[PDB]
Amino acid sequence: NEKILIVDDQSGIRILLNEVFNKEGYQTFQAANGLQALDIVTKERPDLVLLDMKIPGMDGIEILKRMKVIDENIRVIIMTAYGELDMIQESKELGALTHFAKPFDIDEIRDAVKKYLPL
Template sequence: MKDKKVLIVDDQYGIRVLLFEVFGKEGYQTFQAANGKQALEIVTGDSPDLVILDMKIPGMDGLEILKEIKKIAPETKVIMMTAYGELDMIKEATELGALTHFTKPFDIDELRAAVNKQLAC
């Protein structure tokens, strides 16, 4: 488990830092990106095992980023986060390969459990 890599993609600094700390303490090698360009550079260069991806990111939205991640590294697991009840976007994200989604504000323990479960496989 210690060699697993987690990438957090969110334009909100506070959420990135919180999740970075939480998953770092879990023993994961953790990366963070504030936008799609940074996220895709990390996916290409560091091959994270799992990406926690916000749905609403300025410039390139979560669905576009998800599509690109799946092109670069189809085996990468993705968990979506959304602050809105965008059921159509969530449905599309699932069809594109996202495993699950969390609505903000999310329960950090539930998110931690979901990540641990996915990376234990």
């Protein structure tokens, strides 16, 4: 019954992660872009959000900044490729719980969510 938002431009990645948090009985949502995410946040008000940084159009930092305007207590775990030291740092200052560099272990990602997510 816990809500998790998956935000990545890459489709296969949304599918992958979606099929992961369902095995953990989570209520999964997914957006392929900034605006789509910001709506799902407004309406569904998710608990945890897995945000890609490199999304065409509106990047993670920009949407992470906006999600914050909506719900200041938004739990965000950013995911991106190693070598995005800028955004990784910026997202930390903006209030991102932690981050995962692709290609991450389908395992430890599922833990970090169970971790950062209450009951």
